[PDB]
């Protein structure tokens, strides 16, 4: 009976980003005991509720959410004694919440999420004995949680996240016999989680994260079966994870990231066969990862980074055919990389950097069809980077730097279809760059520096998307290829600390955007082509420790660092000609 359904001649036009009361208020003076539902949601309306709404005495449903209503809460609505659900969320109501919701004795749903309320949560609501959902999140509520909200038997959903509440969590809330969902994080609560919460036997969803909580995690919450979602990240919990938590047989998502937890992942975690998401980022955890975590039938997300785990990664990880992202960077893992990680071709993000992994990159990883981001630098991986990565259709970011890769560089990298970043620096190759490395379609950043490269630099054929090229600190001999003006997107080039002879490629001056150039510590000879002084874009041109001769250019070279030279003579701006 909303949007002027029954007239209850007169208006049917409830639209037009106009304001209520007076566009409204006629709706009410159609006095009528015929109106049981009124839905004024998402009409772009702005203001106050008129006193006269008290005359819609038969209302059961009232939803005014998603407008711009303002002012303090209108206590006239408390005269709608038959109201059963009231949705006020996503408005601009402010001030302390006024008393009197008690008279809505049959109220079953109250949603006020996202408002401007301040002051204390209304202790008055503890008297709505039929209520089932309460949502006061998203405002500026202050103070403690009223311990009397624990008398809200019948209540199954409570949301108070995103205010500025604090104090200790009221132990009495643990008597909400029928509570299925509790979301109360993003506040300033202190102290620990009351162990009485272990009586919320129906609880499926438990947040309270990004608060100020502390203590050991209460062992008693192993009692919460039925629970599927447990978020307690961004707090101050210390101590170890209770081994009692292996009894949360329904748990699908676990997130303890950003606390101070110590000790090991409890090996009972290997029994949580419904786990989808295991996240323990940024803690003080240690020891080994229980092998059975590699056997979890539904695990999709495995975040263990920024701890100090020892030992090997579980051999069978990925064999469930479901892994999507794994990140264990910044630990002390050892051993080889399991072959099964991408079984199922669902793995798209594989992050392993800053460990001590050993052995050859498993060749199964070259047939991981879904792989997209691969970061494995700062390890001890040896052998030949296998061939096959350039045949993955979505691999765009690869970092294998600071490892121990030897022999050659896979030639299929140059034919990877969407690869955008490839590093490979620091590695001990002792062979040439792949002949068609510059061919590559998309590839903006390539950085094989200090990787014991040898031989000449291939001709810059194509060079479509490169904007940063790092090859410094190898033994590249020969001449810098003279067709470098094909690299029209180039911004930074470093070929310093090599064995390059010959002249500076004048085609460097076909420079739409070149900014940083470092050719120092080589054996170059010849002038700096005076045309370089016309570049309105070069800010660094380090060419020191070479065998160059002649004047330095002027123009946009006249205000460069003299240190950038150390060879012989140069335009008045140093040692006159």
């Amino acid at each position: 009976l909303s949007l002027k359904t029954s007239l209850s001649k007169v208006p049917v036009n409830g639209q037009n980003d106009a304001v209520w009361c007076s566009w409204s208020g006629v709706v009410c003076d159609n006095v009528t005991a015929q109106v049981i539902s009124l839905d004024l949601s998402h009409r772009n309306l702005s203001g106050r509720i008129p006193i006269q709404i008290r005359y819609l005495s038969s209302l059961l449903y009232l939803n005014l959410s998603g407008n711009s209503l303002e002012g303090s809460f209108p206590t006239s609505i408390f005269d709608l004694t038959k109201l059963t659900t009231l949705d006020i969320s996503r408005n601009s109501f402010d001030s302390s919440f006024p008393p009197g919701i008690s008279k809505l004795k049959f109220l079953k749903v109250f949603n006020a999420f996202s408002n401007n309320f301040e002051g204390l949560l209304p202790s008055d609501v503890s008297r709505l004995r039929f209520l089932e959902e309460l949502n006061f999140g998203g405002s500026y509520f202050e103070g403690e949680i009223p311990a009397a909200y624990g008398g809200l038997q019948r209540l199954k959903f409570i949301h108070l996240a995103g205010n500025v509440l604090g104090g200790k969590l009221p132990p009495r809330l643990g008597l909400l016999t029928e509570l299925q969902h509790m979301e109360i994080g993003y506040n300033h609560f202190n102290g620990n989680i009351p162990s009485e919460f272990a009586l919320l036997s129906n609880l499926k969803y438990f947040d309270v994260s990004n608060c100020s909580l502390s203590g050991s995690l209460p062992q008693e919450l192993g009692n919460l079966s039925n629970l599927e979602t447990l978020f307690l990240f961004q707090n101050g919990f210390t101590g170890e994870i209770p081994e009692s938590y292996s009894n949360l047989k329904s748990l699908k998502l676990l997130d303890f990231s950003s606390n101070q937890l110590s000790g090991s992942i409890p090996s009972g975690f290997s029994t949580l066969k419904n786990l989808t998401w295991l996240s323990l980022i940024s803690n003080n955890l240690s020891g080994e990862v229980p092998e059975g975590i590699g056997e979890l039938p539904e695990l999709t997300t495995l975040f263990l980074w920024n701890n100090n785990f020892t030992g090997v990664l579980p051999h069978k990880l990925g064999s469930n055919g479901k892994l999507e992202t794994m990140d264990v960077s910044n630990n002390s893992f050892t051993g080889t990389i399991p072959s099964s990680l991408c079984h199922g071709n669902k793995l798209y993000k594989l992050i392993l950097f800053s460990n001590m992994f050993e052995g050859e990159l498993p060749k199964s990883l070259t047939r991981c069809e879904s792989l997209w981001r691969f970061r494995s630098q700062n390890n001890r991986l040896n052998g030949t980077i296998p061939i096959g990565f350039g045949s993955l259709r979505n691999l765009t970011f690869v970092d294998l730097s600071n490892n121990r890769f030897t022999d050659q560089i896979p030639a299929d990298f140059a034919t990877a279809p969407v690869l955008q970043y490839l590093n490979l620096s620091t590695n001990f190759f002792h062979r040439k760059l792949p002949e068609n490395i510059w061919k590559a379609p998309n590839l903006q950043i390539f950085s094989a520096s200090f990787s014991n490269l040898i031989g000449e630099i291939p001709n810059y054929v194509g060079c479509k998307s490169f904007y940063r090229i790092e090859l410094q600190g190898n033994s590249l001999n020969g001449t810098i290829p003279w067709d470098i003006g094909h690299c029209e997107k180039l911004l930074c080039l470093n070929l310093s600390q090599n064995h390059l002879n010959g002249i500076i490629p004048w085609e460097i001056s076909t420079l739409p955007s070149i900014a940083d150039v470092d050719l120092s510590h080589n054996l170059l000879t010849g002038t700096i082509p005076s045309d370089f002084g016309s570049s309105k874009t070069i800010t660094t041109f380090n060419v020191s420790y070479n065998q160059l001769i002649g004047p330095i250019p002027s123009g946009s070279f006249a205000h460069l660092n003299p240190s950038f030279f150390s060879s012989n003579e140069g335009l008045c701006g140093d040692l006159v000609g």
């Binding site: 999420f113 996202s114 999140g137 998203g138 405002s139 996240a161 995103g162 979301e183 993003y186 947040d207 990004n210 978020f231 990240f233 961004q234 998502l253 997130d255 990231s257 950003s258 998401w277 996240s279 980022i281 980074w305 992202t325 990140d327 960077s329 993000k349 992050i351 950097f353 970061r375």
Partner: peptide, 12 residues
């Protein structure tokens, strides 16, 4: 005002 929900979005 809006309030974040879900797991921790932090990533590498």
């Amino acid at each position: 005002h809006e309030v974040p929900s879900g797991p921790n979005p932090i990533s590498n």
